[PDB]
């Protein structure tokens, strides 16, 4: 019954593509789908990748329109990538419609030795904007399933 | 038109009701022809909304066949409405078409390298994909039904995806895809581009655009056009000196 649009945010270098490929010969990784069953309820998930480069900054809203959820990926070793998430959240929160369900995803937790964004800053930021924070490692296939499962739960609620 | 009737006859005391409601809507549109295109579009969209719901309620039809018949409805109504609601004289659709056409023409000098396009046109198979993608986006204007215009955008995107995958040997992300679609649009300068976009927005069955692949590719086309409209020296990593020289039409990059 439920059909959900989920936008994916981040530059290529934060490893967003590996993350969604993990979850979902592949021709393209820009539009991706999953059919899910949650509490005997059927869920159609569509993942809409959005161009993360600075030159495309004004285009976000066109992509974000009518989203049900958003997955904002940053690289835990790159504080600039986290700063980008905070600006994206501001945009997502100005979208006309219902509250988009936000995930703030700290990727490459396999490089925790080299992390620049503290767990406390990331989780406290997420709470402040009504988002949820997740740790993932596309490299080691951790946290990916939990993220998408939880988001759908949240989008149903 | 004959096919629509024969199609609906299949559905018994649900097909007659849809036909009546479709005829009512179309009669409503005739008496709205002198209203604004916004008002005409709201009418069609309400109609899509209401016919779909009145099928789930007082009809009991499986959601599989529901999409299939909404496609038939859209084709009947839009085939009949096209001459009246595509690029209407009461709108700035023509004005917008000319401005984007002139803008795309002005930017004929922009290279794929400037846009960081991940396609290598020296590979014959890539070159063939690019040729097809340009033809796909050009063909959009030749189709009357929003679903068929969307199919051109979607075909174009998949030919682009092939071009990128052959060049890079990795599946395109949005970061790979969008600059390539921008480049294809710049090369194609597709006829009546804004009129096609406005028509799809105004008259496409609103559902097909919401989550599924046609919606994604259409959204990307919208992003491409918006980028092209505001493109500046900084967009292409150029000095104002070089950008202005290229814009004069007097200098090759």
PDB file of C-alpha atoms in Angstrom, chain A residues 8 20 32 80 105 115 122 148 153:
ATOM      1  CA  UNK A   8      19.980  10.442  -1.289  1.00  0.00           C
ATOM      2  CA  UNK A  20      22.951   2.161  -1.765  1.00  0.00           C
ATOM      3  CA  UNK A  32      17.062   2.470  -7.211  1.00  0.00           C
ATOM      4  CA  UNK A  80      33.476  19.635   5.674  1.00  0.00           C
ATOM      5  CA  UNK A 105      24.552   8.885   8.056  1.00  0.00           C
ATOM      6  CA  UNK A 115      37.509  10.350  12.456  1.00  0.00           C
ATOM      7  CA  UNK A 122      26.735  14.114  15.021  1.00  0.00           C
ATOM      8  CA  UNK A 148      16.637   1.587   5.498  1.00  0.00           C
ATOM      9  CA  UNK A 153       9.253   2.301   9.866  1.00  0.00           C
TER      10      UNK A 153
END
